[PDB]
Structures are given as C-alpha cells and as structure tokens.
Amino acid sequence: AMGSGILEIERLEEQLSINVYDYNCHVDLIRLLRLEGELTKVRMARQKMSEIFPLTEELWLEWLHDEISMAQDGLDREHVYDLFEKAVKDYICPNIWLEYGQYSVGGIGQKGGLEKVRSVFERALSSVGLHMTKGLALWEAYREFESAIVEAARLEKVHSLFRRQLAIPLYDMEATFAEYEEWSEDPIPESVIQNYNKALQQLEKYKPYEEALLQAEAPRLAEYQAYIDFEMKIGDPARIQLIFERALVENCLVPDLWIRYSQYLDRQLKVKDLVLSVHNRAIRNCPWTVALWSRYLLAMERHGVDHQVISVTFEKALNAGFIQATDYVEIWQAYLDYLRRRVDFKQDSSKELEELRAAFTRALEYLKQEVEERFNESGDPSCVIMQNWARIEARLCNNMQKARELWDSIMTRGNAKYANMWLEYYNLERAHGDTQHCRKALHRAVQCTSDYPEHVCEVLLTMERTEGSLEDWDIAVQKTETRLA
Template sequence: MAASSNAEQTHLQDMEEGDAGMEERDMGSDEGEGEDGMGVDNSEEEEDNSSEDEKENEAEIQRLEEQLSINAFDYNCHLDLIKLLKQEGELLRLRKAREKMAELFPLTEEIWLDWLKDEIRLTEEEPNRDKVYELFETAVKDYICPDIWLEYAQYSIGGMGSPGGMDKVRSIFERAVTAVGLHVTKGQAVWEAYREFENAMQSTVQPPPGMILSREEQELLKAQIERIHTLFRRQLAVPLMDMESTYAEYEEWSEDGVAETVVHQYKRALQQMAKCRPFEEALIAAEPPKLAEYQSYIDFELKEGDPARILMLFERTLAENCLVPDMWAKCTIYLDRQLKVKDLVLSTHERAVRNCPWTMGLWKSYLLALERHGADHPTVSDVFEKALTAGFIQATDYVDIWQEHLDYLRRRVDFSKESSKELEELRGAFTRSLDYMKQDVEERFGESGDPSCIIMQIWARIEALHCKNIQKARELWDSIMTKGNAKYANMWLEYYNLERSYGDPVHCRKALHRAVQCTADYPEHVSEVLLTFERVEGSLEDWDVAVQKTETRLNRLNVQRAKVAEKEANVARQEEDKSDQRRKNKGDKTAQKKGQKGTRAGEKRKAEQDDYHDQWNDKSATKRHRGHGDQTADERMETEAGLFGRKAPPGYKPAATGNKRDQQGAAAAVQKHNDDDDKPELRNDNSSVFISNLAYTLEEPEAKLRTLFETCGPIAQIRPVFATKGTFKGYGYVQFESTVSVAEALKLDRREVEGRPMFVSPCVDKNKNPDFKVFKYQTAMEKQKIFISGLPFSCNKEQLEQLCKSHGTIKDIRLVTYRSGKPKGLAYVEFADEAQASQAVLKMDGMCVEDNTIAVAISNPPRRNLDKPGSNRPMMDMPRQVFGARGRGRTQLSLLPRSLHRQSGLVSKVENGTAAEQVPAAGETKPLSNSDFAKMLLSK
C-alpha cells in the first residue's frame, strides 16, 4: 500500500508541475502582449513557423506510411515513423505504428521500454492496467531483458491495492528470477529488487517495540522472514557478479548466522563464478557484437553441461547478435536435441524466424519441430505459408522449403487406402509447387531453382511405390525429360531404375534405347547398361538390335570427336603460324628502322664502333689472363653500351658471359629483349610474376618494383621492359629466389601505383599453355558480399567503410576501376557473414550518397567468358548480331551463302546432376571460326 501511495503521489506531482508550467507560459504570453505590440508580432511569427513545421512533419508522416504500405518490412522506415509520431504527440497513431512494427519484427529492449513508459503514462487509471500487463507479456517474449522484467515488477507493485495484487507482484518477481536470475552481470539487480519488496512487506507486519503480537500475527511475521531467508539462500547458490557483497549482507541480516548448507552452496557457486569470470571480463572488454567471445563462453558452458546456464548464455548472445542465423541455429539444435521442452523449443524457433526470416534453414527446422511436437495441421500449414513470403535470397531455398513441406504431407498419408483427403492434398501440393517454381521463382531469379526436377522425381517415386500408379510416374518422367534433361545419362538411368523396380521389361528396354540416342554426356555408359540388360532379359533379336544401335551411335560419336579434335588442332596451328608471322614482321620492321637510323647516324656510329673495338681488344686480352669469371660490372656495362651503340636502357641488367662469342649472343638477346613485346625468357617461371598496367611515365621502374615487392621475399632479378628508344612499356617481370614468394606477390594485384591499378599475374608461357587464363574474382553467388552500384566517382574506400560499418564487420572493400585507375562507381563490400550482408542490402538499397541513389544487392556476378576469339567454343549462349558502322542494312539480306548457314545447338555437360559447361549436342555442329569460313569459301 505504501508503494502504491508513493507512485500515486509521484504522478500527482508530475501533473501539478505540468499545470504550473502551463500557468507560467500563459502568464508569460500575457506579459508579452502588453509590450508595445512586439510580443504580438513574435507570437504570430512563432505560430507561423510552428504551423509550417507541422505541415512538413505531417507530409513526412504520410510519405513514410505510404512507403510502408509498399514495403512493410522496411525496418528503418518503421523507426523513423515512430520517432516522428512521438515528436508530434500523435499518441493513437503512435500506438498503431508500434503495434504494426511488433507484428513483423522483434523489438529491442530500448524500443520496448520507450513504448511501455508511454503506455503507463496514458493508462493511469486502474481499469486500464490490464492493457499494460498484456503489453509487458508481449515484451518479455522477444528477448531476455532484465530491465524489462524490473520495469514489469515495479509497475505491478503499483497495483497491489487491487484484489490479488500482492500475489500478482510475487508471481511476476518469481517469473523474473526464473527468466533472468542466472544472468551473471544483471541478474543480481532482479534478486535485490525482489528482496527489497519482501523487506517492505515485512515492515508492514513488524510490530512496534513493546507491542505483543497475536498468534496469527506471529505466524505471518515468521512466514515473511522465512521468505527473505529463502531468497538469500536461492541467490547465493547462483554464480553472479559481486556475490560476495550479497553474502556479507546476509550475514549481517540473519540473526542466527548462516547455515552450513548455505555456506557450502555459496562456495560452490563462488568457484563456478571464478571459472566464468575470465569470459565475463573478455565480454566487458570486447566491442559489440562480441560474437567470438560469446562463442568461446558457450563452448565452455556446453562442457560444463548445466542446461539452465547454457540457455541463459544463448539468450544473452542472441540479444546482442539477433541477426546471426548460425547462432539461432545452434541454439535451436541444442533445444531440439537436449532439452526437448515443447513450449521453450517452439517459442525459440518462432523468435529465430522472426529475427532472420531470410534464412531457409531456420524455417525448415521450425517446421520439423512443429511436427515433432505434434502441432496441429493448420498451424504447420500457416508457418509454411509464412516461409514462402519470407524472401529467401536463392532460388534453391524455395525448392528446399517445398521439399520439407511435401515430406510432411507425405508422412500424413495412409497409403493403405486407395484414396483419402490427405493423399489429394499431397498431390495438390505437388502440383502447386511446380507452378510456384515456374511462375514465382523463375520471375524473381530468372531460374527455376530445380533444373534436375527433384520435386517431380520424388512425386514419380511416390506414385510408383506407394500409390502403385506407374502410369502417372511415367507421365511425370516424360515431363522431366522434356525440360532439357534428356541429354543427361544419370537422368535416364534414374528412369530406368524406376521402371526396373516398379515397371516391366518392355518399358525398361524403351527407356534404354531412347537413352542411347539422346544422351550427350556419357553415351558409352548408357550403351553398356543396355547391353547388360539384354544379356539378362533379352532375346537374340533384342541383342542384335541393341548391338547395332550402340555401335552406330558410338561410331558416329567417335567421328564427331575426331572432327572436333582436328579443328582444334588446325586452329592451334593457325594461331601459332600467325604468332610466328607477327614476330617475323616485327623483326623485319625493327631491322629496317635500325638500318635507316644507322644511315643517318653515319660517321658517329662508325666512331663509336671503332672505340668499342679498341676497348674490346684491350679488355679481351686482360680477360684471357684473368679468366671468364673475373669480368667486372663496369666492363660488362661498357660492353653492353658498345652493343647498343649508345647508353643501355634504364633498368637493363646484362647477364655475365664468358668469351667473345657468348657476348655476341648476349647482345642479340638484349636486342630481342628490347624490340620484342613478348615475354623474355626467364630462368624460372615458377618463381616469377608478370607485372602490367603500370604508367609509361613511371620513373625508375626497377627501383619502384623492388620497393613494392621486397616485402614478398628475396628478389633474384627485376626486368622492366623498355622500347627501342629506352621508354618504359608499362610492364615487366619480377623473379624471386623462392616460389613461396609468388603467392605473396599475387596478393598485391590491383595495388594502386601512381593512380593506376597494378596487375600482378603468374608468369606463364602462353605459347606452351594457350588455354591459360587468370581471373581473380568469383563468378558465383557470394552471400557474405554485397555489390554496390551508382556510387559517386569521388567515393573512396574510407568513405565507403564509414557508410557500411554500422551494418556489420567489414572484411574487405574493393572499388572497381578502369585500367587507367578511374572509378566506375561500383564496389564490392565483404562482411563477416551472410546475415550482416543481408541486413546491409535491406538498409542501404536506395540510399542517397552525395545526391547519387545507390543500388545494393547480394554479390552474384555473371559467368565470365574467358574463351578466345576464334576458338570453336561459342563466346556466349546466344549468337550476337553484328552490324556495320551504319547499323542494320535496309535490305536485311544475308550475304552468307546458304550452304554456310548452320544452326548450333548447345547442351550442358552434367556431372552428378549439375550443369558444368556447354558443349555441342550429338549430331550438331559447332559455330565456325573465321578461318573455317575462309577454307570453305576457298574450296568452292
């Protein structure tokens, strides 16, 4: 009662202070109006400004409400709307906005406390307390929050005067210590609040000094004192921070001292707290979200094996990492396998999918848990329908969730009956799933997500095995084959096995004959299966037909393969001939230029040559006495200068040679080095890297490259490539002493050097390895990485990091640039996990950055085409129409002879049911290269 009166007095004081403030403002406005009219003008201006602000705020509120009507899952939009409504004092609209947000998302502790305090102020009268109680019950379900439980208990104290109010307060406190009493850092506050309440109740039954209590009053006082003893004993048995002060308080409060059993429990809890303290200190010192520290803590508690503490630690972790699907999955797996308490398991699964709705695995686990704990069919179906609207990020996720639902429906069917409601529902679900894959999933992702028709295969097996309806199974397999699967051997063998198990030999034979004709990836294997089948089942006539068909098919296939190999060899020879011809032409041009230059140089060149020969004769005589290995660096430099007829190009490093013949060979090698654009011969390609895209104006490239790569390991030599005039050509080679350094050097790829991205790639002789291609980045979906387009060209890595770091831990940022180093306005940002990337997409897509509206999506780059022009493999899946400089001709006539018109059919090579690459189908020709067209025209 005392607590209730205090709360009421506090509210009355607040109301009186508010009334006084209103009176002061009214008096102030009256006084202002009495001063020579100035007060009136100011008030009018203030009213005009306030009205304009109100109009702007109302327009913004309407805009936010309209945006939420389009996309109800915009989390930041909900927050902005709630903030603006609270600022405007729109209490009813504010309540509705919060309720809509709570239906879609679990709310944080701060949002709940703000909402609860507003509702408490709105419902001061006693009859409306039940609404606040209901709101508290909803709040404590989202996360385990000690502060919300404390607020709940404090609010319930204000209703002690109502019937059953005392019991309700104690009930809420009991639930609070059960829910958060094991919270190592914040649980003590809940225990202390509970004890303070019971101490206050004791003071109401404690008699004044000298007063004699009746027997009933004595029993009541004794029971109250025992309640406080019990609370102390229960708290001291739990490992909590600063539990030593609680024990000292108990010693002081207890008149009879502390029992031995309590001391024993306290010491054991103290020992457990000593084990937990390093983990708690690590959490205090760490920066949010502290996922690694929590993970180590959880692993420790799992070894200890106390379910209550494990669950509490999971709840603490999830409160700070609510958007990490892996942590929710780990928690739900623990509950499914260890505790198996229905209410606890299902509520945790529900919270998991509300926090991470984009994660298919959580929905799948939720559906299994519902079935495992006997949930009714409407509930399971409702959860499945919600999963379909969750917005998964992959087409295959929808296939998996449909498979899980179909498995559930299949387990409900009693196949001993020929027909039942459950069986019809199962067949209807299969039909709906196929329509869903064709319409919704293909429209959103551009792919079906089920190229191998797994759902249809399962349906066919169910019809054949359980329903004994082999005809329906055959119809389904025919549909599967018409969806582009007829060229895969494994699909035909699946069909054959189905017929072998539930069909008859006639249909088995038909399936294998069709397989021999249609299979494009492994026809030999299908042929072998057909022959084996005829050995077991067939007659002599059947055997002869099978042998004839398989031999015909394989012979035709071998001829096609020989033609393909011959064409590839011809193309390789042509490319080699072209390369040799280009090299020869370049050498002729270089020799011609040198001859012209020599004619112009005339007497100066002759004088330099005479000097060179004189120096050579002197040094040769000296060298014959010293030996081949004693030539000095200065002498080699003079020799090379003579070879060039001028000063050697910067960065040139001559090789030590022995006699005059060797030096002449070295001169020829130097000449080839400077004149040829191709890679010079290195002593060891395995320990070398190729550097390109450097600026031509780079000063002292050798020194610059040495500075860049000396951290990768000991360098054997650096060879920048120069033109005949001595200018740097923008590329070169770095050879290390060890192959281990190459991996470190490749990490410097795309490092910016004087405003241009430097390209670093393995040093490979492409004449010996014509198919060698290097592409650094992934071309498949990367769930932990986002792709940003529309960035301003002035945006750098630091600005982008500031923009993205609020959404998660950033591992890497890559700005996409042209070869010149100019930005393209594109970037890739890699986060620590896929949950952070997904949240970044939700919150950043459509954001304005320096007046640019950026687009953000999960990184899913298209397949990069690395085929060479002129190779037999098509450059793209569909042929491109190439027009001249003036575009499409008026007549639209094709100048290509009809004999050269050939349609190319592409099929996908499949390994283990997965499409790998496209190759020409059997019986179909590949697109011809330019050289093939030339041969065909010349042969006419």
Template sequence: MSELFPLTEEIWLDWLKDEIRLTEEEPNREKVYELFERAVKDYLCPDIWLEYAQYSIGGMGSPGGIDKVRAIFERAVTAVGLHMTKGQTVWEAYREFENAILSTVQPPPGRIPSREEQELLNTQLGRIHTLFRRQLAIPLMDMEATYAEYEEWSDSGVSENVISQYKKASQQMEKCRPFEESLLAAEPPKLAEYQTYIDFELKEGDPARVQITYERTLAENCLVPDMWAKYTTYLDRQLKVKDLVLSTHERAVRNCPWTMGLWKSYVLALERHGADHHTVSDVFEKALNAGFIQATDYVEIWQAYLDYLRRRVDFSKESSKELEELRGAFSRSLDYMKQDVEERFGESGDPSCIIMQIWARIEAHHCKNMQKARELWDSIMTKGNAKYANMWLEYYNLERSYGDPLHCRKALHRAVQCTSDYPEHVSEVLLTFERVEGSLEDWDVAVQKTETRLNRINEQRAKAAEKEANLARQEEERADQRRKGKSEKKAQKKFQKGTRTGEKRKAEQDDYHDEWNDDAGTEEMGTKPKRNTWKLRRDSLGGTLPLALNLPPGAKRAQQGDDKPELRNDNSSVFISNLAYTLEEPEAKLRTLFETCGPIKQIRPVFSNKGNFKGYGYVQFESTVSVAEALKLDRREVEGRPMFVSPCVDKNKNPEFKVFKYNASMEKQKIFISGLPFSCTKEQLDELCKSHGTLKDVRLVTYRSGKPKGLAYVEFAEEAQAAQAVQKMDGMEVDGNKISVAISNPPRRNMMDKPGSNRPTTDMMPRQVFGSRGRGRTQLSLLPRSLHRQSGPVSKVENGNSAEPVPTTASAAAANAAGETKPLSNSDFARMLLSK
C-alpha cells in the same frame, strides 16, 4: 512495427513508460500487462522484467495482487536470474518486496502475536530465507555482498548447506570471470567473445547456463543467422521443451526472415512437437513470402513441406484427404518454381527436377500408380535432362523396381539414342539387361542400336577433336608469329641503337681528333689553346667512356643480357611472383622465406636493364621434396602484398599451363567491397565485417607497388553470412567514403582480357580513344632552350648590342639542308657554350 519485427530493449521501455503514463488515470491495467508480456518475448531483457515486476507491485491492493506480483517475480528470476551481471538486481528487488510484506505482518513492539500471526510471520521469514539461499547458489557478480547481507539478516546464522552451495557458486564465478571481463572490455557486438563463452558453457554442460549465454549473445547479435541456427539446434537436441523450442524458432525467423535454413528448422520443429496442420501450413506460407536470396532456397523449403505432408498420409487407404493435399502441393510447387522462381531469378532452382523425381517415386512406391510416375518422368526428360545418362538410369531403376521389362527396355533404348555424356555406360546397361531378360531378336536389335549410336558418337568426337586441334594449331601459329615479330622488332631496335651509338662515338672521336689537330697546329704557330676549351674536350671525351655502376649482382647479369635465369631442373624449382618492386635485397629476403622448406641450391631474382627488381624470380632447391613445402607459402603476405608461389614450368614445352590464383566464377560466400578509403587496413576491415559472421579470409587489393586500390574481398564461412553482409554493409560510410558491397562475381578473364572481345559497357566510364597505336608520347621538348638548335644564323649579343652572326657548323648546316635533326657533336656543344 512490433507485429513485423522484434523491438530492442530501449524501444520497448520507451513504449511501456508511455503506456504507463497514459493509464495512470484509468483503472485498466490489463492493457499494460499484455504489452509487458509481448515485450519479454522478443529478447532476454533484465531491465524489462524488472520494470514489469515493479509495475505489478502497484496493483497489490487488488484481489490476488500479492500472488500475481510473486508469480511475475518468479518468472523473472527464472528467465534472467542466471544473468551473471544483471541478474542480481532482479533478486534484490524480489527480496525487497518480500521484506516489505514482512513489515506488514510483524506485530507492534511489546505485543505478543497470536498463533495465526506467528505462523504468518514464520512463513514470510521462510520465504526470505529461501530467496537468499537460491541466490547464493547461483554464480553472480558481487555475490560476496549478498552473502554478507544474509549473515547480518539471519538471526540463526548461515547453515552449512548454504555455505557449501555458496562456495561452489563462487568457484564457478571465478571460472566465468575472465569471459565476463572480456565482454566488458570488448566493443559491440562482441560476437567472438560470446562464442568463446558459449563453447565454455557447452563443455560445462549446464543447460540453463548454456541457454542464458545464448540469449545474451542474441540480444546483441540478433541479425546473425548462424547464431540462431546453433541455438535452435541445441534446444531441439538437448532441452526439447516444446514452448521454449517453438518460441525460439519463431523469434529466429522474425529476426532473420531471409534465411531459409531457419524456416526449414521451424517447420520440422512444429511437426516434431505435434503442432496442428493449420499452424504448420501458416508458417510455410510465411516462409514463401520471406524473400530468400537464392532460387535453390525455395526448392529446399518446398521439399521440407512436401516431406511433412507425405508423413501425414496413410497410404494403406486408396484415397484420402491427406493424399489429395499432397498431390495438390506437388502440383503447386511445380507451378511455383516455373512462375515465381524462374521469373524472379532467371533460373529454375531445380534443374534436375528433384521434386518431380520424389513425386514419381511416391506414386510408384506408395500408390502403385506407374502411369503417373511415367508421365512425370516424361516431363522431367523434356526439361533438358534427356542428354544425361544418370537421369535415364534413375528412370530405369524406377521401372526395374516397380514397372515391367517392356518399359525397362523402352527406357534403355531411348537412353541410348538421347544420351550424350556417357553413351557407352548406357549401352552396357542395355546389353546387360538383354542378357538377363531378352530374346535373341532383342539382343540383335540392342547390339545394332548400340553400335550405330557409338559409331556416330565416335565420329562426332573425332570431328570435335580435329577442330580443337586445328584451333590449337592456329593459335600456336599466331603465337609463334607474334613471338617472331617481337624478336625481329627487338633485334632491329637493338641494331639501330648500336648503329646510332657507333656513329655518334665515331663522330665524337673524329671531332676530337680534328680539334686536337687544329689546336696542335695553332700551337706550332705560336698560339696556345685556351685552358677552358681543353677542359671541356677532356670532359666530353671522358663522358663517352662507360661508367662502372654500383649495381646488384642480378642487375649486372641483366645488363649483360642474362635476364632469364637458367634453371636446369624445373622439378626442383618454384616461380615466385607478385613481389613489390621496392623490395630491398630480394635474394636475401627470398632465402629467409624459403630456407625452412629445405636446402636451397640457387636463388635468382630478376632485374631490369637499369638494375631495378622486376618483382619475380626463381628458387631452386636441392631436392624435389622441398617444392611441395614451398608451394604451401603461396599467397604469404610479404611487405603488404600476397606472394604467388607456383611450379616452375617451361612455357615452351607446356604452353597451356596456367595457374589461377583466384577464382573467376561467382563465389556466394565471398563479398567484393569497393570505395574503401586508402587508409583502411586489414584489421579495420576485419573488425567491420566480423559482426556479420565467421570470417575465413580478408584480402585488400593493392597495386604492385603495394599501394591500396580501395578494393577488398572478404570470405565468410557460409553463403547466408555473405548475403547478410551485403544487405547490411552496402552503402555504408567508412571514414567518409561510401562503400559498395556485392557478392563476388569477377569477370571471366578469357573473355574480358582478350583483345577485341566485347566487354560490357554498362555502368562504366567511357574510355578515351587514342588511336590504333594507343596513347602517343608527349610532344613537349625536354631539351633546355639554351641547347636548342637554331634554324638560322645565331647572332652574338654582347652588352645588349647585336654583333655579327655566328654561322652554324657544317654538320648542322648539312642536317638542316637534309631536313633532319642530327645529334650534336662535342665541338658543336663547345662552340655553343663558348659563344655565350
């Protein structure tokens, strides 16, 4: 496993301890030493270095054992001695070892040492003094205790030089203390805290401290390609130490093999530090098998390797081994793009044939082989590039620089015939060429050919424009028909509703007058009407009167048909949408949001007929300058929803105007997350994703009401970070929910939202079919059973005994006879209720 991937500090320690136990009875300690050497190369691990040094102490008895222990301790303090929190343990272990050696060279009490013994004693004391001084010159945690220990140990006291260095280190320690405390308080992987620490050390300018901070960061963030890229770039440009630079590049590609940029930097670093050709080629072959996530990554790594091979060639020789290897690599790269990349990704990755263009230019410029260059350009044009003017002009410039006028003219003539994007430009270049190089006959041929081609192009453009205009006109006619049909339908419904309401009120008034006359006649005959009957009539009559509702001003206007605001100047207005329906006092809320943009002339939130806020409205400013400031508030979060702010445009005058709030194409730096728990907040999602790279935006998708949908979009600073997040987060469980993560690739709205469009059916639940008119209304009756009209005579029941049937009203009987349901009048309700 260690051959393929770096191992963590915990795994290495477990492995090393097992090997140490297995070799206790064997004299072979070299096997364990080799394992320690592999372990210290993966990450910066103070505990592994400490274990390595302590294990080496057990071999002091062998020849040269003490020197070997000292060498390992020296490497340890060089590697991790600057570690602010863990470096002190290595220094203390080193001093304890030297103190143990000191006890063996001190003479017994009462005996005067010989001169050789005294020299050996002084040398050992000098080693311990040096260790104290070196440690006190480095900012470390709890360095005050080390200084106190040195004062107690040293018989001659502490020198002024040591005190001065100790004070400087203490001051540096105080500068670093806030960063160390933030690291201690933060949760892993602490990427943001480490980045802040690195920025601080870069400003301080101490290369050793910058290096140790990067190493500490990568020990906890080993799968962040951007951090490896920053570290290797710093080493390439600042330290430039061959062993350190190359080992770091190797570790980078072992940790993040899917990142093409790290392999490319590795190849360049190998060439920069004079690595042999076999090593560079071996690294390149490993890069091809690393499994990049984009077709273009393979094009870039091939370009880096071909550049390296080109720089090895001595073009002063007509032929050489390096030149043949370069040509073979170019040929192999084209086969690789065609066979491997296209089959894997479904695209070439090099549509403009950049690799072939470079090969052709090398053949023309360095090898003076225009025949090969022309063959390559013929192949480039046959791959679908003949319709582009810039490709022909690139070929023309090559012929102009290294070819002859005959082939220049031939290339321009072919360009005029084949170019479809900018034929006018190609024609102008041809005519300019003939003005400089051609004869009168050549000029006449060029003029005739360009005129014929341009006339044909203009005819095609006119036909295309006419076709587009016809389609637009048809679409406009269909839209007008739809609008007209909706208006007629709405007017018809309004008329029918008004008619029914008028008939109902007239019937109620007639019934009331009839009842009043009947009661009056009864009173004249000496019979008083019942009090509860009169009360019912009065309530029924009062119920027909309009009620004064306590609605917002906007809602009252909406009731009066003023649903569409009248904004006189669209240039000074903005349209606000995507607000929550539950927004309280929307006019005051909008005024608070937009009053910083400039003086406001009018705010018009739109309400429904029932007085409910529709979630959109208009803001009109006194000056058009304020509109630009208001548009900056687009997507500002208002009560958990992104508020959309767009220019106020009359759709009748500009029917094609559209404002797309979000990208509808693939966004390789953005990921789409589904299956999130509804309780997930933006802060929780930010904490979940920031370990994979630098976040630019986090957006939770919600309904208009503000309730979450369980979906989110997260945008990273770079595409590699988004790819890493997909690889690491897909299938992860969040609060018991298994989430799905993919690169953001929303469906095209113009294809997916049109009625009758062929929507993809894969991976989708089958939709329920409701018929041509959609889902029908519920068939349940919402009228209480006591008020249901009975089809036959109603039997009056008193005390459980059946009484004589109560006949229905004349109006009800007429309605039953007609097979229709007529609304009940006040008298009908009165008879039904009083009969109980």
C-alpha cells in the same frame, strides 16, 4: 518549418504503405507520431512494427513507459500486463523484467496481485536469475519487495531469496553474504556457507570470460562463442540457455547462432514449447535463411502442431523472400515431405493424398511463375520436385501413368542429355514398371545420353543379357556399337 511533422508523417506512412518491411521507416514514423502527440496512432504504429519485427529492449521499454505513465484504470493495468507479456518474448530483457515486477507491485490490494508480483519476479528469475551481471538487480528488487511486506516478522521469504541467490554465481555476492550475515541474527547454515563458497568459486571460474566480454567491442561474437563452448562442455542446460540468449541479443542476425541454439534444444532437451518458441524467434530475427523456416516446420511437425498452423507457417515462409531459387525449392520440398508424411497409402483414396498432389501441382506452378519471373531460373534444373512426385506415385500410389508423364516433363527440359537421369527413370520402371518399359527407356537413353553414353549402353546390355531374347541382345549390341562408334 510549420507543420513539417504532419507532412513527413504522411510521407513515411505512404512509404510503409508500399514497403512494410522497412524497419527504420517504422522507427522514424513512430518518433514523429510521438512528437506530434498523436497517441492512439503511436500505439497502432508500434503494434504493427512489433507484429512484424522483434523490438530491442529500448524500443519495448519506451512503449512500456508510455503506456504505463498514461494508465488510469484497472483495465488499463491488465492491458499493460498484456503488453509486458508480449514484450518479454523477443529477447533476453533484464530491465523489462525489472519494470514488470515494480509496475506489478502497484497491483497489490486487488485480490490476486500478491501472487501476481511473485509470479513476475519468479519468471524473471527463471529467465535471467542466473545472469552474471544483471540478475543481481532482480534478486535485490524481489527481496526489497518481500522486505517491504514481510508480514508478522515472517522472513522465510527474505531468507529463502538470500539462500537461493547466494548459491548462484553473480557479481558482488560477497556483498549479499555480508548484508545477510548482518541481517539474519541466526547462523548462516553450512549448506548456505558451502553453496555460497562453491558459488564464489564459480565467479572466480568465470571471471576471464566475463572480462573477455567487457573488453570486446561491437557485438562481441567471438567472446560469446568461446563462452558458449565453455558452458556447453560444463553442460548445465540452464546456463547454456543463458549464454545462448546473452549472445543472441547482441548477435541476433547471425543465423548459424540461431541454428546452434535451435539444434541444442531441438535435439537434446526437446521440450515442445521452448523449442517452438526459439524457432519462431529465429524466423522473426533472420527470415532470409530458408534453413530456419525448414527446421521450424520440421520442429512443428515433430511436436504435433496443428495442421492449419503448419500450413499458415509455410505461407509465411514462402513470403519471407529468399535470395536464391534453390531456397524456394528447398522450402517447397520441406512442405511437401510434411504433406506426404500425412497420408496413409494403403487405402484406395484419401483426402490427404489429394492435398499432397494439389500441393505438388501448386509447387510446380509456383516454380514456373514466381521463381522464374524473379530469378530467370527454375530452382531445380534437374526437376527434383517432379522426381519425388513420380517416385511417390509409382511406388506408393500404383499410379505408374502419372510417373511416366512426370518423367516425360523432366526429360523435355533438357534432362535427357544426362545418363544419371535416364538411369533414375529406368530404375523407376524396373522397380514398378515392366521389362518392356525398361527396354524402351534404355533405348531412348542410348540415343539421348550426351555425357556418358557407354554407361547407359552397358546397363542396356546387362538388362538384355539378364532377361531379353537373343534377338533382344543382338539389337542391343547393334545400338551400342552404332552409338559408341
């Protein structure tokens, strides 16, 4: 039908105008914009999708090819580089690295672009150079490049690439050892023979695992978990990054896998940029699991990420949309713990303390409104945000009145039927109130508790026996008697 593309593009653009988080809508919109030839609009649509989602290697590769096969300038070259730089972040991508290398080969002649090629291949190798099946292509392409240059019969570059590859367990390395012997008229030194042979021993070691992947269907999660384990016991940080990544490209929706990888980096070789990177990638691949946002905020805090960045990240976390109210309480509590750990409490007043209190009010209102309106629940039925606030105010801020207010609020939402709650507040008054307030609290407790009144009773008697007048003890015995009768 005539002009159907125009109308369907309008339709999809409007459907995205309401629900921006529609992946298939972006994919469709982009293919139709390509068929109509609206090039700049394809570029924009692609940019918005890539800023919302991780793109697979095929989508990244399509966009890269379109920008490359359309580039007529040196500035276009720098912009293409920028696009590659953005493309490598999402997942492990051997082909993207290959294309980046070869496309960068065009950059020679321009002064600073021999090193540019070597940088691209070097980072390519550092990333996937160990890849059992796809690294070989990168080693080979890098060597083809150095061979096509090899100025003045200076084969130290090609030699080095051979010697670095041969010490590494990838497929058909025997073939590379072959081409090397037939190439280097000099002997292949015993360091290279020894390392080559232990490497071949690493191929034979790993064969059953790789063939487990080959046979398996779908995303092959089980096989990746077995390989993850095996490599994690063998304990090479490089090789466990590699298998975590290889498993993650195929299993990137599995949050617990992100947590395993995240946790290994986060706790064991905590290099800032790498863990912050992997956390960000986790919250882009599985934004529905608040745990990922929590560990990410904890990671940022641990690594001294600037204040404003953490705040903005929290805002993204709020907006991610979780399926349980306990999750909104959870992320709010994470943010508030961060805010509290920001305050010095030994000064009359603070800028940071006021931000903490303000964030508490905001958190409570947000649970009153957004979470209730979307769930018909409070998220914390037992007012834990308020509890933590009262604790802070009483124990750290000398502000006992606010704590009393907050516990008023806590008890009014039906928490007064619970002995545990009464004892939580009592312990607060005992900690930072006075004996009068503890008495009031425990009396009220004796007359409100529904689950375990005898427990509050015995605490009351204990308190008066320890500290109250004989009149006080007598009143206590009467209340408890009348209550438990």
